[PDB]
Write an enzyme that holds these catalytic residues in place. Sequence first.
Site, PDB file in Angstrom:
ATOM      1  N   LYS A  50       0.743  -1.094  -0.177  1.00  0.00           N
ATOM      2  CA  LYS A  50      -0.124   0.031   0.123  1.00  0.00           C
ATOM      3  C   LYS A  50       0.988   1.459   0.101  1.00  0.00           C
ATOM      4  O   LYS A  50       0.445   2.455  -0.221  1.00  0.00           O
ATOM      5  CB  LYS A  50      -0.998   0.159   1.202  1.00  0.00           C
ATOM      6  N   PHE A  91      13.079  -5.079   4.137  1.00  0.00           N
ATOM      7  CA  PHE A  91      13.881  -5.555   4.765  1.00  0.00           C
ATOM      8  C   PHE A  91      13.335  -6.462   5.901  1.00  0.00           C
ATOM      9  O   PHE A  91      13.245  -7.675   6.093  1.00  0.00           O
ATOM     10  CB  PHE A  91      14.875  -4.651   5.506  1.00  0.00           C
ATOM     11  N   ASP A  96      10.845 -11.511   8.184  1.00  0.00           N
ATOM     12  CA  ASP A  96      10.061 -11.912   9.298  1.00  0.00           C
ATOM     13  C   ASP A  96       9.132 -13.059   8.654  1.00  0.00           C
ATOM     14  O   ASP A  96       8.756 -14.141   9.273  1.00  0.00           O
ATOM     15  CB  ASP A  96       9.005 -10.780   9.406  1.00  0.00           C
ATOM     16  N   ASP A 100       8.558 -16.445  10.455  1.00  0.00           N
ATOM     17  CA  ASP A 100       7.120 -16.890  10.697  1.00  0.00           C
ATOM     18  C   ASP A 100       6.552 -18.227   9.969  1.00  0.00           C
ATOM     19  O   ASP A 100       5.523 -18.625  10.105  1.00  0.00           O
ATOM     20  CB  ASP A 100       6.287 -15.829  10.504  1.00  0.00           C
ATOM     21  N   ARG A 105       2.821 -12.935   0.364  1.00  0.00           N
ATOM     22  CA  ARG A 105       3.059 -11.798   1.025  1.00  0.00           C
ATOM     23  C   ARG A 105       2.816 -10.778  -0.158  1.00  0.00           C
ATOM     24  O   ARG A 105       3.065 -11.181  -1.392  1.00  0.00           O
ATOM     25  CB  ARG A 105       4.487 -11.408   1.256  1.00  0.00           C
ATOM     26  N   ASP A 167       8.691 -10.754  20.394  1.00  0.00           N
ATOM     27  CA  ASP A 167       7.634 -11.388  19.567  1.00  0.00           C
ATOM     28  C   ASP A 167       8.012 -12.793  19.523  1.00  0.00           C
ATOM     29  O   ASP A 167       7.382 -13.807  19.767  1.00  0.00           O
ATOM     30  CB  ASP A 167       7.602 -10.902  18.067  1.00  0.00           C
ATOM     31  N   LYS A 193       7.811  -3.725  18.014  1.00  0.00           N
ATOM     32  CA  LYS A 193       7.929  -4.328  16.803  1.00  0.00           C
ATOM     33  C   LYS A 193       7.152  -3.896  15.318  1.00  0.00           C
ATOM     34  O   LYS A 193       7.574  -3.874  14.401  1.00  0.00           O
ATOM     35  CB  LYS A 193       7.521  -5.741  16.812  1.00  0.00           C
ATOM     36  N   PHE A 232      -2.620  -0.267  15.303  1.00  0.00           N
ATOM     37  CA  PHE A 232      -2.561  -0.846  13.737  1.00  0.00           C
ATOM     38  C   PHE A 232      -2.101  -2.358  13.883  1.00  0.00           C
ATOM     39  O   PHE A 232      -2.229  -3.086  12.977  1.00  0.00           O
ATOM     40  CB  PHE A 232      -1.318  -0.040  12.953  1.00  0.00           C
ATOM     41  N   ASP A 236      -3.658  -5.832  12.542  1.00  0.00           N
ATOM     42  CA  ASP A 236      -2.916  -6.701  11.726  1.00  0.00           C
ATOM     43  C   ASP A 236      -3.341  -8.057  12.303  1.00  0.00           C
ATOM     44  O   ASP A 236      -3.406  -9.165  11.611  1.00  0.00           O
ATOM     45  CB  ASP A 236      -1.523  -6.429  11.951  1.00  0.00           C
ATOM     46  N   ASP A 237      -3.158  -8.226  13.599  1.00  0.00           N
ATOM     47  CA  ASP A 237      -3.745  -9.503  14.215  1.00  0.00           C
ATOM     48  C   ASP A 237      -4.831  -9.976  13.933  1.00  0.00           C
ATOM     49  O   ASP A 237      -5.169 -11.211  13.711  1.00  0.00           O
ATOM     50  CB  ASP A 237      -3.438  -9.319  15.815  1.00  0.00           C
TER      51      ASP A 237
HETATM   52  C1  LIG Z   1      11.716  -8.391  10.993  1.00  0.00           C
HETATM   53  C2  LIG Z   1      10.982  -7.168  12.069  1.00  0.00           C
HETATM   54  C3  LIG Z   1       9.620  -7.661  11.658  1.00  0.00           C
HETATM   55  C4  LIG Z   1       8.217  -6.688  12.219  1.00  0.00           C
HETATM   56  C5  LIG Z   1       6.965  -7.399  12.231  1.00  0.00           C
HETATM   57  N1  LIG Z   1       6.041  -6.287  11.374  1.00  0.00           N
HETATM   58  C6  LIG Z   1       4.888  -5.903  12.510  1.00  0.00           C
HETATM   59  C7  LIG Z   1       5.651  -6.805  10.363  1.00  0.00           C
HETATM   60  C8  LIG Z   1       5.177  -8.335  10.079  1.00  0.00           C
HETATM   61  C9  LIG Z   1       3.868  -8.621  10.659  1.00  0.00           C
HETATM   62  O1  LIG Z   1       3.079  -7.625  10.740  1.00  0.00           O
HETATM   63  P1  LIG Z   1       2.818  -9.749   9.311  1.00  0.00           P
HETATM   64  O2  LIG Z   1       1.347  -9.938   9.646  1.00  0.00           O
HETATM   65  O3  LIG Z   1       3.756 -11.031   9.229  1.00  0.00           O
HETATM   66  O4  LIG Z   1       2.813  -8.848   7.822  1.00  0.00           O
HETATM   67  P2  LIG Z   1       3.997  -9.825  11.972  1.00  0.00           P
HETATM   68  O5  LIG Z   1       2.236 -10.120  12.448  1.00  0.00           O
HETATM   69  O6  LIG Z   1       4.607 -11.147  11.942  1.00  0.00           O
HETATM   70  O7  LIG Z   1       4.702  -8.927  13.123  1.00  0.00           O
HETATM   71 ZN   LIG Z   2       4.812 -12.425  10.014  1.00  0.00          ZN
HETATM   72 ZN   LIG Z   3       6.376 -12.072  12.722  1.00  0.00          ZN
HETATM   73 ZN   LIG Z   4       0.611 -10.155  11.336  1.00  0.00          ZN
END
Ligand SMILES: CCCCCN(C)CCC(O)(P(=O)(O)O)P(=O)(O)O
Ligand SMILES: [Zn+2]
Ligand SMILES: [Zn+2]
Ligand SMILES: [Zn+2]
Lengths: 342, 342
Positions: A50, A91, A96, A100, A105, A167, A193, A232, A236-237
Site C-alpha cells: 500500500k 527488509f 519476518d 514466521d 506476501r 515476538d 515491533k 495498527f 494486523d492481528d
Molecule cells: C523483522 C521485523 C518484523 C516486524 C514485524 N512487523 C509487525 C511486520 C510483520 C507482521 O506484521 P505480518 O503480519 O507477517 O505482515 P507480524 O504479524 O509477523 O509482526
Molecule cells: Zn509475519
Molecule cells: Zn512476525
Molecule cells: Zn501479522
Amino acid sequence: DVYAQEKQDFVQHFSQIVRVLTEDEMGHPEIGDAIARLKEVLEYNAIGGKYNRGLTVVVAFRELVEPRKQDADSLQRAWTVGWCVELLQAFFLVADDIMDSSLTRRGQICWYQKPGVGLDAINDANLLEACIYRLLKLYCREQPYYLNLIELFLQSSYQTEIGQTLDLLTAPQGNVDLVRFTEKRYKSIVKYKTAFYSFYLPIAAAMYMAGIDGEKEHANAKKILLEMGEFFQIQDDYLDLFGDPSVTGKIGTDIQDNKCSWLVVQCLQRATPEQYQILKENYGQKEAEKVARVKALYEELDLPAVFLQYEEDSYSHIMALIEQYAAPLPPAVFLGLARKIY
Amino acid sequence: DVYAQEKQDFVQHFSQIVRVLTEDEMGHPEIGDAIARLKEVLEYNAIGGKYNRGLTVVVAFRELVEPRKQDADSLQRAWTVGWCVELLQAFFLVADDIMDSSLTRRGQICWYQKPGVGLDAINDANLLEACIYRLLKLYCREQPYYLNLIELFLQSSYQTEIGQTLDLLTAPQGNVDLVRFTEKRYKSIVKYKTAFYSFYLPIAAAMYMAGIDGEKEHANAKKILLEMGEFFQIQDDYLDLFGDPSVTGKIGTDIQDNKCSWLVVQCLQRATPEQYQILKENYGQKEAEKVARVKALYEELDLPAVFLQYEEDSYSHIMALIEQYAAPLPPAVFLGLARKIY
Ligand SMILES: CCCCCN(C)CCC(O)(P(=O)(O)O)P(=O)(O)O
Ligand SMILES: [Zn+2]
Ligand SMILES: [Zn+2]
Ligand SMILES: [Zn+2]
Ligand SMILES: CCCCCN(C)CCC(O)(P(=O)(O)O)P(=O)(O)O
Ligand SMILES: [Zn+2]
Ligand SMILES: [Zn+2]
Ligand SMILES: [Zn+2]
C-alpha cells in the site's frame, strides 16, 4: 485522499530509486551479477504493498515544509526518504516471512519460498537494509538533517528488532505458551515491533527534513504515533485470522506459530476453564483442524464484535490524543494518517 | 606479538561492552527479556574467535595516534570501535552459517543449529549489527570522526553483502557450476565478501580516529589491505578442506555447497578432461564419498603444494606493496597485520 493524490507519483519514482541503486555501481562491472540480483530483490519485495509508510513521509513533508521551500530537489529528497522507509519495511518483511514460515506476501509467494531463493533471502533482506543508507548518502549527504535521518533509521531498526526478539521469545515453537500471553506483554511487543518504524519513523523523518528537531515536538508526536501503531498491530492481528485473503495479500500463521496475538490475549481474558483447555490443546500447532478449533473458539467468544468495538474506542482515543498533542504541528498531519488506518 | 600484548586487555573489555549494551536499556524494563536474549547472543557469537580484526583497530590506533593524545577516554573509544568490528563479524558469521548450512563455528555448534534457536538466529544476527551503531553513538557521538565511522561501517557492510550475493549467485545448489568458477570471478567475490571488512575497515577506522581522513591516504592503505584480504580468503578456502578442525574451530562445507573456492578454481586450471569429468560429477553434493573423491583429486593435483607456494609468493607481493604504499603511515601498521596472517 491526500495519500491517493501523492501515491501514483510516489510509485513512479521507484524506477529512479532502482536506476540510481544500480548505476552508482556501474563503475564496477565485476559486481554486475549482484546488482542484477539486487534489482530483482527490489522489484519483488519493495513493490506491491500500500506504500502507506513511504507516502506518509511525502504527505507530512508537504504539510510541514513551507511551499516556497518545496523546490524540485527538496521534493525529490522527500520521496527518496519515503522510499527508504519502504525499503526498511521490505527488509523486515523478507526476514519476518522466513521466521514466521509464511507462504504468501502482497498477493504472491513469499520471496524465500520462491524456488531457487530459499535462505539466500537472508542476504537479500540485508541488502535491502543497506540500500537505505546508500540513498540517504546519495540524496541527503549535504543536508543539515543528514545525521538526524541516519540515526533515526538506525534507532528505528534497533527498536523494531528488539520488538521482533520479544515476538519470538514469547512464541517458542512446540511449547504451550498461554500464561505468557498477557495484555502487558502484548503492548510491549507491538510498541517495539510495529509502532516505532511504522508511525513514528515516517513522521519524524519529515519533521527533521522540515527542520523540526526539538526533543519536545518529537516526544509529543510520538505520544500520538505509538498509540496509532498499537492499534495498527491489533488490526494486523485481527486480519491475520478474520481478514479477506484477497484483500490482505497474505495467509495468516499467528495460531500455528503460537503467537501472542491480540486475539489470543482477548480470548484468554474471556475463556472459561473449559475453553482455556481447548485453547491449550489446539494453539501453536500446524494441524488445520486444531487451528480451525481455535478460530471457532474466537468466534464463540465474539472476538470479531469485540474488535469492532475496540476499533471505534481506539479511534476516539487517538483523536483525543491528537487534540492534546498535535500542536504546534498541523492536525491534518495526524488526521490523514488516522483516516488511512481507521 | 603487538596483538598478543593488546589481546587480553581487549577481551577483558567485552564485559563492559555487554554491560553498556544492557544498561542503556535498563530504563525500559519491558524489553528485559529481549536484552537478556541479546546478552546470550553476544556471549555465544562474539566470543571464541581470534579477535584479529578488533585487535587491529586497537593496535593501529596506538601506532597512528600520538602517545600524548592517547588518554583513557581515547583508548576506551579505540577498543569500543574494535569491538564494533567484532560485532560486524559476528553478524556476518551467524547469517553466513545459516546460508552455508554449516555445523560448527569457533569450536561449538553454530548458533542457528542450537536447539531452540533455528531461524530466530536471523533476527539475532541483525541485533548484533544494530549494536555497532549503538556503541558508536554511545562512545563516539561527540568526536569529529563520528560520521566518518558510521559511513565506514555502513559502506563496509554493503560491500560485504554484495560480495556475499556474488558468493551465493556463483554457487547455486543442485547445479553443476564449474564453468562459472574462474579466477576473475573468484577475485571479485573475495575482494567484496572478505577484503573490505576484514582488512580495510579496521585500519581505516583507526585512521579516521587518528584524524587521517584524506582520500589519498585511504586509497594507498586500501591498495595493500585489499590484497591482504584476497590472500586471507584464499587461506580460508584452503583450510576449509585441508585445515585441522581442532585448530580452525569449524567444519568445511565449500565442496558440498558448490562454492567457487580457490581450490576448485586451481583444480579446474590443472585438470585433464578425465579429472574435469570426475570433478563435474562429484562437486556440489552432500554425499561424503563424492566430497572425498573431490579432495582426492585436489591432492592428486598437489593443490596443497600449490597453495604453500602461492602463500610465499603472496607474502612477497604484499611486502612489496607495503614498501610502495605504506608511507606516510608507519610500516609497522601493515607489517604487524601481515605477520598475523602469514
Ligand atoms: C523483522 C521485523 C518484523 C516486524 C514485524 N512487523 C509487525 C511486520 C510483520 C507482521 O506484521 P505480518 O503480519 O507477517 O505482515 P507480524 O504479524 O509477523 O509482526
Ligand atoms: Zn509475519
Ligand atoms: Zn512476525
Ligand atoms: Zn501479522
Ligand atoms: C554474511 C557475509 C559473510 C561474509 C563471509 N566471510 C568471508 C566469512 C564466512 C566464511 O569465510 P567461513 O569459512 O564460513 O568462516 P565463507 O568461506 O563462507 O565466506
Ligand atoms: Zn561460511
Ligand atoms: Zn559463506
Ligand atoms: Zn570459508
